[PDB]
Structures are given as structure tokens and as C-alpha cells.
Design a protein around this nucleic acid. Structure first.
Ligand code: 4QM
Ligand code: ZN
Ligand code: ZN
Lengths: 50, 146, 110, 700, 227, 153, 196
RNA sequence: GCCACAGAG
DNA sequence: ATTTTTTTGCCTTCCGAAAATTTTG
DNA sequence: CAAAATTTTCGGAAGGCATGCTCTGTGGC
């Protein structure tokens, strides 16, 4: 009902960043892309969607 | 969306030239706005319908919409597919500047993307003009509630 | 009537005067303009918008009748296109619209 | 940009402009004091300074801000005034005379924390990450909030369709006098009304009171060659004939017969009408001679705007347009308060001087300066009170504003940051949807699109964007001379009949003359601005509907820098960015080089801005520096806010100021009335560029 | 609709925003009959049926000449003639004119004379600027009229204005099926017992548009307490 | 001659045609015997040709004046530096090119030229003397047109 | 880009005090030809207030209304135009002498507008005659009030109007502007550097 | 105690 | 003793002024 | 018949009300 997809993207970006060891960016009209974080997650043995 | 945009541009061309047929109770601008709004609502409904029929079972927004516990088909369509036209006080986005909505669009522009149609889903991220138009609609809702 | 006095570019007004004849006179400077035998008129052409003939296009492929047009002194046509229409209540006769085929000048009756 | 112009620094700039420059204007407005008894006695304020003596090389000592916080004192610096007067028969002058204590804004040029390193911040028990921009009064830290008003010295046209009337209002605001004038429509006729005038005056009579004495000239100025405007306005030409007024003296008698202005001296009715037309009808336009052309053309332009509004109701001005609104910072408000305080001080001092001089038993003339202090404290007291209570009551300007200052919120670091840069709306009681409470598209990039509270103040109080600047006032006479040089024919030698056959030029809303080629004039003025010959905050914009080119010079306008695009290519290249990153060629060098320029809302109207480099067509005029400027400082905490719904972002802007966390580096040396701290704060995993820019990750 | 409609119904508001009268036509399946009925209720100004208005000054006589047109009247099919326009000019009491002055010249010209230190010029200027705004046909309170084709295909004539009685007394309009969303108008025309149905129906329609689903016994109680 | 004493009727143009008649009215006032950039370029070329022919027409004609509008600060000239009101003698030249454009060179700076606002009223030049023995004010001629010189930047 | 012909520009007359009159009511062109210049009978000029007053005798044979003027205006047969000379900088009145354009500085430009002094005189006479039948340290004036007072108290100067003096003026202007030629000093860019 | 803003749902 | 506003809509009662109608000469 | 008294109609101004319901804090007079 509230449609906060940005929250899910924040969760995946944070998970991939803490597995990779670097803080991520959720900058408006930009920021860290979802494909890179999915690649980081799948390289660490986790699911691409978190 | 490209088909709808091309048709809307055709209506803009006919309106600018002057051979646009008018509704029985409306003038040229009113019938242009009504036809464009109907076309954009139709394309939003079509994209939403092709979106909902494709989502597989055990999809959590789909389950929560089927139950009626929270959400609806429209919210799922807005998250996964086109958000749709932004409507302020029953009309499209008013001309905040002189004869246009934003300086990022040409003067006397009545294209769907220049007057409050958000192509992008909430998953794909909104462009700055679509972000501003959605902010206008949300602010109208907030003020009305307040 | 928008006219201005050529001497001082002030607005001209029309007064009756002692003689009872109207003149374009200036209340600022000694100037008058008599209009005896001279016509003055300030025409305000009101805008005219196109109107659709609400009865036009209805006299096509309809039966004819032998009714003399009221302009008998100018022409003597007899055949006229006629049709019936109900524009009134249901308890009073349904009116007839009929137009002459030679002189136009459409007219109706009950 | 944030290293030079910033977001919190705007307040500082205004306070700086109040201290270095505008105090001299306030002083020179009412610098002279006479005596009722002795005609040879006169007092003259020749200079003014704050927190510095003319003799001492080093600025005087002030208590540190944290000491003022702890001891419930007022962080302030004395006001020094140089005064020339007469003591007996010889004129004598005295410098560094204290007349009060100005509470100085923290981190301004008069503060102890100006350009101080982190070690000196640690020595003074002050956090280096404190935004500054507030006043410590009686121990409490209060912020003078930004006020939003309709544009001053500009004609604003509005209509009531349900009542059927139209009007054009001008709010003249000048250091000499402040007034409001209306040109209204009543019963199909046009009248001019003012607070000083008892009854509404027909527009023909007030136009005849000025230099215009012809009805044809009046009708040609108001209407021109358009037949519909003449048909609408011709009714008002008959009211001059109905009331048998035909010369300038008759109209001056008629106007002066119904003036309610109380005067100290008895004055002739003709002279009263001359005074009312010269100084009272339009306050910011004054005439010092027998020529009334500028005033006449101003009233004629107002009447023409009224007529154009009556012909079709779509030619009105939008009150919600950001280009029609100006922002008063702390400097302007403290100026408008200190003007009243200094006027009251001058009146009290003149009364005391007249009281002492009426006694003839003293052979030796006394020293007037010995009686400064017994009045001077009043200034300080009043000054402190106007920042302490927050009540803003000034009977001279009929101003009864409340809640000008607010206690600075210390619930979080971002809470104190967002209390700074907050706009207070003019209409606090407007409960109508899509009025002042709507999010206008005009505030794109100037005001935050998400930072507004939920509740009864939704849409009224609002916050600034990230990369914005608020213009400060600067002189317009060089701009006027430049206009005359560039090819503008002056208003005093052009034809009244052919004034509407070509574009007019409006300097600060005042019709200065006519221009044959408006586009070439605008291009030349932009070239002069980009080269650096005039100030970069002067705004040029051509309105084709009114056939005018407007040059705005005064302060209060919201601005925004943008990258210039010429011939389909962005003027900022890779070598410039490499130079900027290497250490040289900062934002000021970008301004002088002509790569970026400041656009206000009105100039943004006459523009075509590209959001990205890949979207540039040859017709584009400017390029966006970066898009997330459109979100403010508080809204910048949201990660991926373009994937969210807008009310979620608004609720986050509301609740981010209530989050519990670290306040400042000196939070354990502070004694605050209520302070929430978190034991183990952590910086966010998903950051934002705004988070790094405002140092939120240092105090999360 | 919505909350403002409820607000303006539950109080005896003499004037409301957007009042609609839904007249049912006697002949519902002809566009021409619908248009000629619409011409009887939709107000037509003098400016809509005139070529020019002008002020003429002669040697000793001063008047205002109006040239009406017959082509526009014939094509729009108004049941209006020249003498009807003259008597409509005389019936405008705000112009301060009487039938002794209005005269007919030709089949198109109408002359309004003026007779009496400067009163005649002012009075003729006032008359010239007020004359093309008089109402020669239609009801004085009807803002506009439209012809709506319903779902079943039959045509109805729905107007904005406050003259319910004049609409339902107009020939071509069934007076026994003409209604109005305005409630005090229905109370004045048809009585209190029809005002009660108007209240109940309007509140029920407003609630049902938003899908509130209130049981109409509460609405009946509210209407009974009001009436 | 008495036709000038007829009540003057002001110029009336319909509202939809006011933006189109401005060219015709502006050309009729003189009565010789980027889309906006192109329009102003055409207007500037026409103005240059009109200024050239009007300058050629008033050669040695008595009581014929034309008003120049130069910048209030002329370029500095070496003293025989000098104040703006102290200039005397030749200061520059009006030059005509093969394209028909006109340029006013003063000192070392070239500047544009345009005929500016069109006045519908009569102007004359009046000399003035406030000599106490006999104060006189003689007419010298009528102003026929106006030109404006602006810096080339 | 090459120049085909040049017209020299000369400046002279630093003490001429040349004024320019601007009649608000009199048009420049009637029909298609220049209009006839009005005949000036009297001229007055207040020196310290720069007030110009020009009297033009209007025709009494046609369109005069002798009754009104002889009754309530004391038979005024001339129209007077009043103006204030506004000091405009950068205006030069120029003529041509064999493709040589000579410029003379313009001191003031006056917007002459019709004046109705007889109406004010009649009004003040009526006020005095209706007030005398049955009646029923102070100089702090600054700005426009002081200017109006000093314009009211100061007396007009009856200037001797004359025509056909253009030949002597042209001779002295050409003679004063022929001996000297001034050498250019400022660079093109230095002029653009300040007061563009 | 009175005002004044600030927030919560 | 110069001199801004700072919501927006709805409602009844009053109170001259002018219009409409009847009533005296 | 038209002058004079009586009554009705019609405006603009003058009043009034609304501008949620609860709750928690501070700061200054
Ligand atoms: C110019 C607008 C005038 C408008 C506000 C006036 C003119 C016509 C008036 C209505 C009619 O009189 C008929 C009704 C009479 C009842 O008693 C009260 C209601 C009723 C609907 C009236 C209300 C109101 O009084 C109206 C609409
Ligand atoms: Zn006159
Ligand atoms: Zn026939």
C-alpha cells in the first residue's frame, strides 16, 4: 500500500556493501545500481534478490 | 507506451493546426485534454493488465491483493509497471511556468511526458520531472488529508 | 463616441446648448464642431460567431408538396420540400417545415 | 559551491550585508537631528560600525558563545557610531560612541568563530560541525527564520472572479518610507486607493495630477492601438468630465482635499495634494522637481495591467509563483527592526534635548553625548526582546508578525541543520487545497520537494534546496546608466502614443524607457554579466506578453547556478573539471570564466534547461549541474528516494529531525533543557552524496 | 460532490455551486427538436443576434441604431422576431427606457431615441455600453444549456440555472419528469414533500458516488428532521 | 488647412491584429518617399538603409535636424583625459559597407546604429540666451528622426 | 567588410545651450506630408525652475465658440503649452554639411503639454468672490514642495522669439568644428572594460 | 497564570 | 504626529435610497 | 391628472460564525 521499493533496494545495497566491505550510495536519480549489488551478492554465495 | 505517445503527438499536431474535432459540450483544449487523458488511462490499464497476468503464484503483493489484507492490483501495477498519469485537481499538471510545466520542456509543450505521465515504474526509478510531478500529486493528497 | 479635441487632445462631449442643436464641444478650450447637415456615428461591430444550421440538411430525399411560397409577388413556385417534426407537446399538432425549391426563404407552420 | 556560498551561509551573508552595508543606509536615512528651541543645534550620525572601534587595531573582546550559553548571557557586540554635533558655538565630532549592543550571529564576520580552525573550536568549547547562523539571547539559541513575502516594488495583478473585480497592488518598500497602493476595478470603472487617501480616486484624476494633462495621452498610454482596451477604458475618461477637473492644479486640489495624513505643520491643500502624489501614492518612486513622468507612467502601466486583466482573466499574476515571491533573511528583518528602534531613539533623544534646551538658566551649553546611555540601553533591550520573545510588533509599518524567531531544535544534528534554511509562508491561515499549500512546479531546484511537515502547517512552512543562493541588495544606478548606454531611449523623451509599438525596459519594476531591439539588448546584457562587468546576481528576462524586458537588481530573490550551453555543446569541459579537481579553478573562477551562471525563477522562465548531457539538443540554453539539488538537506538522508512514494519521503523529512543520535562534539560540555543521545551510533550502510556533503556521517 | 455537497445540502443554502436542471424532452430521438427546444431555454444576448450597435447624432435628434440579423436567428431557429427584440429592450428596467422611444426601421433596424447641461451624452454612452448585454430570449438565470445523449440513446436537455418552473413550463419539455439537484428550488416549486425526496436522493447520490454505502434510513431520518 | 480642426479620431486596431499591424504602423509613421533574432536582423538592415537614405536626403537642407543618441561617456581623447562635454572637432566616422550595414567608429571603437523609437509628434530645436540686456530664444529647425549608437560588445 | 564611403562626425557648440521642444498634441505628419509648423506669439522661460511656456494663437474665425470664452474665460484666443526641461545626457542634435555630420549637445528636452491657466484664474477668482462675501520658522519645505513654491514665486522672462537664425548658427558651428582634429587615445577593449 | 510558537495521532 | 498584509466562505439583520403603488386634492 | 403619502424592493455595509478532536513539551512576560 505504501510502495517503498527504495527500501528493498537499500537492503540489497547494504547487504552487498557489507559483504564487499564498502559503504554504498543511495543517491537520488542515481546511486549504486541493483545489478552490481546482485553480482556482489551472488559472488559471495547469497541469492541475487537478497 | 510508444504507441500511446505517437497517437497523443498526432492529436497535438491536429490541435495545433486547428482541425481537431470537438466534443459536443467542450471546446478544443478541453476535448484534447479529455482524449489524451482517456488514452493515457487506457494505456496504463493495458500495461497493468499484462503485468498482473504474468506474475507467478506465491508473489507476495499478488497474494496480499488477492486476500484483500493490504494493497490492490493498482499498487502492484505501479510498483512493477508504469506508474501512470499524475492528476492534480482533476486535470493534468498545470503550467507552473509560462505556457509550460518545467523549463526542461519546450514552450507550448503538451506531450504526455511534459504534463505528468510517469513512464517509469517505482522499481526502475523516477526521472526528476516525473519525481516532481509525483511530488505535486502526493502533496495535494497530504494537504487534502490535513 | 470617442473623439478628441484637435486643439488640446482632450475628450469632446455633446451638449444641447441654448439653441437646442447638438455640437461636439470641448470643456477645456474654446472649441466647437457643429453637426448641422453632418452625420456622426461610432459603430461598434459586435463579433459574429459561426452558427450551424440546425434545420439544414433535412430537406434532402424527402417528399414534396404543392404549397405556394409567401413571396408570391416575386415568384410563383409551387413544389416545395416538406417534412414533419414534433417540437412541441404531444397534445398539440406536430409542426411542418417546408421550403420552396426556387426562392428559398424557409418557413414553418403548425 | 558549498565551500563558498553554501546552504547555511545564506543567513550569514544577509547578516554580513546588514552589518557592513545596510546599517549605513539605515543611518543615512535619518542621520540628521534638529532642535525645536535652538535653530543652530544639529546632530549628524556620519558612520556606524559593530564590534570594532575606529582607534583600536584589534576587535574588542567578546564572551565565547558557550560561555554565553552556560551563564544565560547574550552573545553581542557594541554598536559604535561617529557623531558630529555642536557644543556651544564650535562644531565638535566624537568617534566610537556606544548606542547599544547588537547580538551578533554566530560564524559571521563579527563573531569569534569566524574562519577558525578545529583547535580554536576545541579551545572555545564549540563544535566545528555546528552550522551556525543563530543568536544566543539570554542563554537560549534562537534562529530568525526565513520569511516569504510577495515581491516588493513590483506590480502584482490579481482578480476575484466570484466577486467580479480585479486589482493591481504595489508594495513599495524603501529605507525612507513603506506603503501599499492599489489600482482596483469597481462598477466597471478604475480607481486608485491608498491608506492615506480617505476616498477612492478615479484613475483619470490621479493621472491628471501628474504631468499628463491630455485625455488622448491617457488613453494612448493605458490602451494604445488595441480597440478592445479602448472600449473597456473609455468609461473612465468620462469621470474626469463629470467631476469638472481639467488642469493639474484642480486634480491636486481634489486629491489633497481628502488626505488623512496627519502633519506636524499646517500645510496648504494644494501642497498637501502635491505631497500625496510625490511621496505617498507610490512610495518607492519619488520626485524632487516639477517632472512627474516616471510616476505617471508607473500608474499608467498599472492601469494597463488592470485593463488587460479585465479583457481576459488569464493575464493575472500568480501569487504562488516563486518569481513573484521574495525571501527575507535575518539581515533584512533586523534592518527593518533597527530602523524602528533608531527612529524611537532619535525621537527620545530629540525630546530630551528640547527639554534641556528650554531651560535658559544655563550659560554654558551642555554635552549632549553625556545623555546617550540613558536612552541607549533601550535599543539593546528592544533588540534582545525582538529576538527573545519572537513577537514582531512595529506600529510604524503596521506590522504585527509573530513567530519570527524559533528556539533552535537540538533533537538531532540534522534537526538543527533543517531548522536552519526554513521558509515561513505569508498566509498562515490558508486552509484551501491547491492554493499556497500546493507544491508549485516553479520551485524546482529552489525549494525542497519533500521537506514539509504533516499537520496543519502542511505546504505552508517549507525548506530550501541544496544548491541555492538568496540575492542581496546592490546599487542600481550603474545598471541604469548601462541601460542608457546600451541603447534604451529614456522615458522623458519618447512618445506617449508610440510607447506600445516596441518593447519597454523595466528596472526593478520601474519603466525606465524603451528599446528597439529587445533580443540584442538581452544578449548583450547576458554577455556583460557572464564576462563580469556587472554583478552576477542581476537578472534579465524578456516577457513577450507584456512586451517588456525586466532587469531585477534588488535582493531577496532565490537563485540557482546552472551550466551554460552554447551551440548545442556544454560550456564546461573535461579540462575545467580536471583543473577543479586538482585544486585550482574554483567555483568563483567558473563564474568569471562564463561557464556557469545564476538563474532565478523569472530567468528560468526564459530558458530551456537540459537535465543531462545526453539530452542536449541545439536549442537548449542551460545544463543542470546535478539533479538531486531538488531535494534539500533533510530530504538527502533518504536512500533511493526516487523509488519511493512522495508521502513516504515527506514523512521521512518529518521524522528525521526526531531521530535520537549524536548532537555535536561538545555535547557532553553542553547543558540543554532536553537532550537525547544514543550510546552506539552508526553511520548508514547506504549513503547519499548529501549525507557526505552535510557531514551527517560524522554525527549519525 | 462529496463533502461540500453534503455541507451545502444539510443547510438551507439559497445559492449553491453548479446547479443542474435535467429536463426530459417530449421528442427525444431527434437532434433538430432537441436543438430548437434548447434555443427556448438557453439565454441569447443581443450581441448574439445583432450586427452592430451605434450612436447617431443628427441636427437636433439623437438616437441609437441596432442592426439585428435574420440569418443567425433562422439558422439557430429561435422563435424570436423584431418586435420581440424591441419589447425585450423595453423590459430591461436597468436601462431606464420605455416603449415610447423604441421604434422599428425596416425589417432589421431598431432605433432607440434619446430626449433631454451635459446629460444626454452621458446617458447615451451608458445606454450604448449597456444595450448589447440585454436578454432578448431565454431564461434570465440559465447560465448555459447542453443536450446529452444518454446510454440508451435518447436525448435529454440539462441546463445550469435556477429557473426550474420556467424550464418545466417550457413547451417541448415534460414538466412531470424535470428535476433539479437544488433543494430549495424544488421546495419553492413543488412543495415540502418533494423537497424531502430531493434531500434524500441528493444525499444518497453523494454517498453512493464515493462508495460509502450508508443505509438510506439514516438519510430519510435526516430529511424528515429537516422537513 | 481647416481639415486639421476636424475632431481627431484615435487609431483603433482589432485585438487579434495588434501584433501584426505593428510592422505596417511603424513603417507608416516614418513614411519615406531564433525567429526573433532573424526578425531583428531584417529590422536592423532596413534601419541601416533608412538611416543612410535619410542622411543623404538632408544634405545642406536649412532648418533640418536629426537627434543623435550617443553613450554618455564617450571614449577618452588626448588633450590638445578630456571631459565628455569638452570634446570638439572631428571624433569619428559613419561607415557604409557593401552589405549595406552602417557602423559608427569613434576613436578606436566601432559601434552599431539604429533608428530607434518612432515619434508621432512634432519636435523642433530651440536655442536659448539669458543675456540680461536682451534675452532671446530663436528657432533653428525641426527634428526629423532620431538615431541611437550602441557599443559593439 | 571593406568600407566604400565614410561620413565624418564632428562635435561643436559647448556653450550653445540648445533645447528641444516636444509638443504632445501637435502631430508630426498629417496624411503623408509634414504638417505646418504652428506660429508662436509669446515665449516664457523660468530660469531656475526650467519651466517653458509657449503661446500659439488659434484661429477665431472657424470653430472658436466666442460665447463661452467671452463669458467665463475672459475671451482667451490663444492656447498655451507648459513643459519642464528635463536634463538628458547623451543627446546631440545633428545636421549635415556636405556628407559631414555636425553634432551639438542638447541641454534639456521639454514635454510641452496644454495648459489651462485661465481655468485656474477663473476658479481662484470665484473662490475669492465667494469667500469675501461671508467668511466662515515655518519654511521646512523640502523636495517637491520647495520646487513648486520657488516655481510659483519666481517671475517669467519674456523671451524675444525669432526665426531664421539657422544660418549664423550653422556658420559658427562649422567654423568652430573645422580647425581641430582629435587623436584617439583609448583602446577598443579598454572602453568595453568600464561603463560599457 | 496569560500568551507565544513547537510537535504527537 | 510619513508609512504594508500576513484565509476564505457563508449567513442574517439593518438601513437609507430608489422604485413601485396607492392615496389625496 | 399628478402631487404627496405609504409601501415594497434593492443595494452595500455591519455584524456574527466557521477556520476539527485530543495529547505532549518549552520560552518569556
Ligand atoms: C444574479 C443571481 C441572483 C440569484 C442569487 C437569485 C436570483 C434567482 C434566485 C432564485 C429564484 O428567486 C427562485 C428561488 C426563490 C426562493 O425563495 C429561494 C431560492 C431560489 C432558488 C432563488 C435563490 C436566489 O435568490 C436566486 C437564484
Ligand atoms: Zn479642447
Ligand atoms: Zn417560393
Amino acid at each position: 500500500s505504501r510502495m517503498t521499493v527504495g527500501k528493498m533496494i537499500e537492503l540489497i545495497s547494504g547487504k552487498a556493501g557489507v559483504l564487499n566491505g564498502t559503504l554504498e550510495y543511495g543517491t537520488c536519480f542515481g546511486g549504486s545500481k541493483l545489478e552490481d549489488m546482485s553480482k556482489i551478492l551472488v559472488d559471495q554465495g547469497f541469492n541475487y534478490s537478497g | 507506451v510508444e504507441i500511446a505517445y505517437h497517437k497523443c503527438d498526432e492529436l497535438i499536431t491536429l490541435f495545433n493546426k486547428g482541425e481537431l474535432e470537438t466534443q459536443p459540450g467542450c471546446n478544443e483544449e478541453q476535448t484534447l485534454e479529455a482524449k489524451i487523458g482517456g488514452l493515457l488511462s487506457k494505456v496504463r490499464e493495458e500495461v497493468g493488465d499484462v503485468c498482473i497476468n504474468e506474475l507467478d503464484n506465491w508473489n507476495a503483493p499478488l497474494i496480499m491483493a488477492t486476500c484483500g489484507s493490504k494493497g490492490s492490483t493498482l499498487n502492484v501495477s505501479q510498483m512493477v509497471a508504469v506508474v501512470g498519469q499524475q492528476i492534480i485537481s482533476g486535470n493534468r499538471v498545470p503550467d507552473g511556468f509560462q505556457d509550460r510545466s518545467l523549463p526542461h520542456f519546450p514552450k507550448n509543450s503538451k506531450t504526455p511526458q511534459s504534463k505528468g505521465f510517469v513512464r517509469n515504474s517505482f522499481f526502475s526509478g523516477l526521472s526528476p520531472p516525473e519525481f516532481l510531478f509525483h511530488a505535486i500529486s502526493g502533496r495535494e493528497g497530504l494537504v487534502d488529508t490535513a | 463616441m470617442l473623439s478628441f479635441c484637435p486643439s488640446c487632445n482632450n475628450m469632446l462631449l455633446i451638449t444641447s446648448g441654448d439653441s437646442g442643436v447638438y455640437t461636439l464641444a470641448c470643456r477645456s478650450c474654446p472649441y466647437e464642431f457643429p453637426i448641422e447637415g453632418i452625420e456622426i456615428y461610432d459603430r461598434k461591430k459586435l463579433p459574429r460567431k459561426e452558427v450551424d444550421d440546425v434545420l439544414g440538411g433535412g430537406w434532402d430525399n424527402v417528399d414534396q408538396t404543392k404549397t405556394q411560397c409567401p413571396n408570391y409577388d416575386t415568384c410563383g413556385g409551387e413544389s416545395a420540400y416538406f417534412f414533419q417534426l414534433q417540437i412541441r407537446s404531444a397534445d398539440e399538432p406536430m409542426t411542418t417545415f417546408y421550403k420552396c425549391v426556387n426562392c428559398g426563404h424557409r418557413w414553418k407552420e403548425n | 559551491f558549498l565551500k563558498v556560498k553554501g546552504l547555511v551561509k545564506q543567513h550569514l551573508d544577509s547578516f554580513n550585508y546588514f552589518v557592513d552595508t545596510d546599517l549605513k543606509k539605515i543611518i543615512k536615512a535619518n542621520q540628521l537631528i534638529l532642535s525645536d528651541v535652538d535653530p543652530e543645534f544639529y546632530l549628524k550620525y556620519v558612520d556606524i560600525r559593530v564590534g570594532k572601534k575606529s582607534s583600536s587595531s584589534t576587535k574588542d573582546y567578546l564572551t565565547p558563545p558557550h560561555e554565553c550559553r552556560l551563564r544565560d548571557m547574550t552573545y553581542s557586540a557594541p554598536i559604535y557610531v561617529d557623531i558630529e554635533y555642536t557644543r556651544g558655538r564650535n562644531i565638535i565630532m566624537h568617534k566610537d560612541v556606544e548606542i547599544g549592543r547588537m547580538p551578533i550571529m554566530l560564524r559571521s564576520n563579527k563573531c569569534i568563530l569566524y574562519d577558525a580552525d578545529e583547535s580554536k573550536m576545541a579551545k572555545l568549547n564549540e563544535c566545528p560541525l555546528d552550522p551556525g547562523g543563530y543568536f544566543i539571547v539570554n542563554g537560549t539559541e534562537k534562529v530568525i527564520l526565513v520569511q516569504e513575502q510577495l515581491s516588493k516594488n513590483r506590480i502584482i495583478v490579481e482578480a476575484d472572479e466570484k466577486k467580479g473585480i480585479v486589482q493591481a497592488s504595489v508594495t513599495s518598500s524603501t529605507h525612507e518610507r513603506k506603503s501599499k497602493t492599489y489600482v482596483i476595478t469597481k462598477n466597471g470603472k478604475i480607481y486608485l486607493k491608498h491608506n492615506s487617501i480617505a476616498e477612492e480616486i478615479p484613475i483619470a484624476i490621479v493621472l491628471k495630477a501628474c504631468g499628463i494633462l491630455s485625455d488622448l495621452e491617457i488613453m494612448q498610454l493605458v490602451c494604445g492601438n488595441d480597440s478592445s482596451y479602448q472600449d473597456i477604458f473609455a468609461v473612465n475618461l468620462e469621470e474626469s468630465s463629470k467631476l469638472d477637473i481639467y488642469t493639474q492644479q484642480q486634480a491636486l486640489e481634489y486629491i489633497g482635499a481628502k488626505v488623512k495624513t496627519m502633519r506636524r505643520q499646517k500645510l496648504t491643500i494644494l501642497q498637501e495634494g502635491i505631497e500625496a502624489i510625490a511621496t505617498t501614492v507610490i512610495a518607492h518612486l519619488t520626485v524632487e522637481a516639477l517632472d512627474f513622468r516616471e510616476k505617471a507612467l508607473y500608474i499608467a502601466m498599472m492601469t494597463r495591467r488592470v485593463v488587460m486583466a479585465m479583457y481576459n482573466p488569464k493575464m493575472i499574476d500568480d501569487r504562488d509563483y516563486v518569481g513573484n515571491k521574495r525571501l527575507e533573511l535575518a539581515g533584512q528583518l533586523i534592518s527593518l527592526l533597527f530602523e524602528d528602534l533608531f527612529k524611537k531613539f532619535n525621537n527620545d533623544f530629540k525630546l530630551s534635548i528640547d527639554k534641556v534646551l528650554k531651560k535658559p538658566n544655563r550659560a554654558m551649553e551642555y554635552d549632549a553625548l553625556l545623555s546617550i546611555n540613558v536612552h541607549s540601553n533601550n535599543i539593546t533591550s528592544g533588540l534582545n526582546r525582538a529576538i527573545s520573545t519572537g513577537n514582531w510588533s512595529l506600529k510604524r509599518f503596521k506590522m504585527e508578525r509573530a513567530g519570527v524567531t524559533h528556539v533552535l531544535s537540538r533533537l538531532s544534528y540534522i534537526s538543527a541543520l533543517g531548522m536552519m534554511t526554513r521558509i515561513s509562508s505569508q498566509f498562515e491561515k490558508s486552509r484551501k487545497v491547491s492554493g499556497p499549500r500546493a507544491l508549485q512546479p516553479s520551485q524546482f531546484g529552489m525549494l525542497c520537494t519533500a521537506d514539509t511537515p504533516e499537520g496543519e502547517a502542511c505546504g505552508l512552512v517549507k525548506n530550501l534546496a541544496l544548491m541555492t543562493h538568496i540575492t542581496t541588495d546592490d546599487e542600481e544606478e550603474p545598471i541604469k546608466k548601462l541601460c542608457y548606454v546600451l541603447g534604451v531611449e529614456d522615458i522623458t523623451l519618447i512618445d506617449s502614443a508610440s510607447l506600445h509599438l516596441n518593447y519597454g525596459v523595466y528596472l526593478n519594476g520601474t519603466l525606465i524607457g524603451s528599446i528597439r531591439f529587445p533580443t540584442k539588448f538581452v544578449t548583450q546584457f547576458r554577455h556583460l554579466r557572464r564576462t563580469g562587468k556587472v554583478s552576477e546576481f542581476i537578472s534579465i528576462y524578456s516577457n513577450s506578453h507584456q512586451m517588456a524586458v525586466h532587469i531585477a537588481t534588488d535582493g531577496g530573490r532565490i537563485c540557482r547556478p546552472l551550466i551554460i550551453v552554447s551551440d548545442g555543446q556544454s560550456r564546461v569541459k573535461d579540462i575545467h573539471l580536471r583543473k577543479l579537481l586538482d585544486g585550482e579553478l574554483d567555483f568563483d573562477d567558473f563564474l568569471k570564466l562564463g561557464l556557469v551562471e545564476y538563474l532565478d525563477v523569472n530567468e528560468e522562465n526564459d530558458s530551456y534547461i537540459a537535465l543531462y548531457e545526453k539530452d542536449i539538443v541545439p536549442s537548449m540554453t542551460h545544463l543542470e549541474i546535478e539533479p538531486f539539488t531538488i531535494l534539500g538537506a533533510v530530504a538527502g538522508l533518504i536512500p533511493y528516494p526516487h523509488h519511493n512514494q512522495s508521502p513516504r519521503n515527506t514523512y521521512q523529512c518529518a521524522m528525521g529531525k526526531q531521530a535520537i543520535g549524536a548532537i555535536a562534539y561538545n555535547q557532553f560540555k553542553r547543558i540543554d533543557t532536553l537532550l537525547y543521545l544514543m550510546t552506539y551510533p552508526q553511520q548508514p550502510m547506504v549513503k547519499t552524496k548529501t549525507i557526505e556533503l552535510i557531514d551527517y556521517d560524522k554525527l549519525p | 460532490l462529496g463533502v461540500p455537497r453534503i455541507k451545502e445540502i444539510i443547510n438551507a443554502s439559497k445559492v449553491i455551486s453548479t446547479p443542474i436542471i435535467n429536463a426530459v424532452l417530449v421528442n427525444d430521438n431527434d437532434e433538430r427538436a432537441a436543438r430548437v427546444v434548447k434555443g427556448r431555454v438557453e439565454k441569447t444576448l443581443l450581441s448574439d443576434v445583432a450586427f452592430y450597435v451605434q450612436d447617431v447624432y443628427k441636427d437636433n435628434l439623437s438616437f441609437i441604431q441596432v442592426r439585428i440579423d435574420l440569418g443567425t436567428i433562422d439558422k439557430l431557429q429561435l422563435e424570436l422576431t423584431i418586435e420581440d427584440i424591441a419589447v425585450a429592450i423595453t423590459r430591461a428596467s436597468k436601462l431606464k427606457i420605455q416603449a415610447s422611444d423604441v421604434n422599428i426601421i425596416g425589417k432589421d433596424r431598431i432605433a432607440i431615441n434619446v430626449f433631454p447641461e451635459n446629460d444626454v451624452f452621458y446617458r447615451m454612452q451608458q445606454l450604448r455600453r449597456a444595450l448589447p448585454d440585454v436578454v432578448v430570449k431565454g431564461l434570465p438565470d440559465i447560465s448555459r444549456a447542453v443536450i446529452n445523449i444518454r446510454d440508451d440513446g435518447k436525448r435529454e436537455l440539462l441546463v445550469e440555472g435556477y429557473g426550474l418552473r420556467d424550464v418545466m413550463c417550457t413547451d417541448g419539455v415534460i414538466g412531470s419528469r424535470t428535476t433539479t439537484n437544488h433543494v430549495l428550488e424544488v421546495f419553492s416549486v413543488l412543495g415540502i414533500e418533494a423537497a424531502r425526496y430531493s434531500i434524500i436522493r441528493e444525499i444518497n447520490y453523494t454517498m453512493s458516488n464515493h462508495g460509502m454505502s450508508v443505509d438510506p434510513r439514516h438519510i430519510q431520518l435526516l430529511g424528515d428532521v429537516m422537513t | 488647412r481647416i481639415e486639421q480642426l476636424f475632431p481627431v479620431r484615435p487609431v483603433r486596431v482589432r485585438h487579434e491584429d495588434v501584433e501584426t499591424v505593428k510592422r505596417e504602423i511603424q513603417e507608416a509613421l516614418s513614411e519615406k518617399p531564433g525567429k526573433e533574432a532573424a526578425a531583428e536582423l531584417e529590422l536592423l538592415n532596413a534601419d541601416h538603409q533608412h538611416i543612410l537614405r535619410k542622411l543623404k536626403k538632408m544634405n545642406n537642407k536649412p532648418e533640418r535636424f536629426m537627434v543623435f543618441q550617443l553613450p554618455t561617456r564617450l571614449p577618452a581623447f588626448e588633450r590638445p583625459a578630456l571631459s565628455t562635454r569638452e570634446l570638439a572637432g572631428k571624433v569619428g566616422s559613419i561607415r557604409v559597407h557593401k552589405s549595406g550595414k552602417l557602423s559608427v567608429k569613434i576613436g578606436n571603437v566601432v559601434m552599431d546604429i539604429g533608428k530607434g523609437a518612432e515619434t508621432t509628434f512634432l519636435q523642433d530645436v530651440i536655442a536659448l540666451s539669458i543675456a540680461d540686456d536682451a534675452s532671446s530664444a530663436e528657432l533653428l529647425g525641426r527634428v526629423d528622426g532620431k538615431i541611437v549608437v550602441t557599443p559593439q560588445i | 567588410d571593406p568600407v566604400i564611403e565614410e561620413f565624418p562626425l564632428k562635435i561643436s557648440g559647448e556653450e550653445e545651450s540648445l533645447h528641444v521642444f516636444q509638443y504632445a498634441n501637435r502631430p508630426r505628419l498629417v496624411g503623408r506630408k509634414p504638417a505646418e509648423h504652428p506660429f508662436i506669439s509669446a515665449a516664457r522661460y523660468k530660469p531656475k525652475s526650467h519651466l517653458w511656456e509657449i503661446d500659439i494663437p488659434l484661429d477665431e474665425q472657424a470653430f472658436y465658440n466666442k460665447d463661452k470664452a467671452e463669458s467665463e474665460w475672459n475671451g482667451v484666443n490663444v492656447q498655451t503649452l507648459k513643459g519642464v526641461g528635463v536634463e538628458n545626457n547623451g543627446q546631440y542634435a545633428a545636421f549635415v554639411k556636405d556628407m559631414q555630420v555636425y553634432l551639438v549637445p542638447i541641454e534639456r528636452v521639454a514635454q510641452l503639454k496644454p495648459f489651462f491657466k485661465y481655468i485656474d484664474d477663473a476658479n481662484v477668482t470665484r473662490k475669492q468672490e465667494d469667500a469675501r462675501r461671508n467668511p466662515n520658522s515655518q519654511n521646512r519645505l523640502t523636495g517637491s514642495l520647495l520646487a513648486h513654491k520657488v516655481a510659483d514665486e519666481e517671475a517669467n522672462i519674456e523671451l524675444t522669439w525669432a526665426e531664421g537664425t539657422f544660418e549664423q548658427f550653422k556658420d559658427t558651428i562649422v567654423k568652430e568644428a573645422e580647425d581641430k582634429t582629435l587623436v584617439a587615445l583609448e583602446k577598443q577593449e579598454d572602453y568595453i572594460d568600464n561603463l560599457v
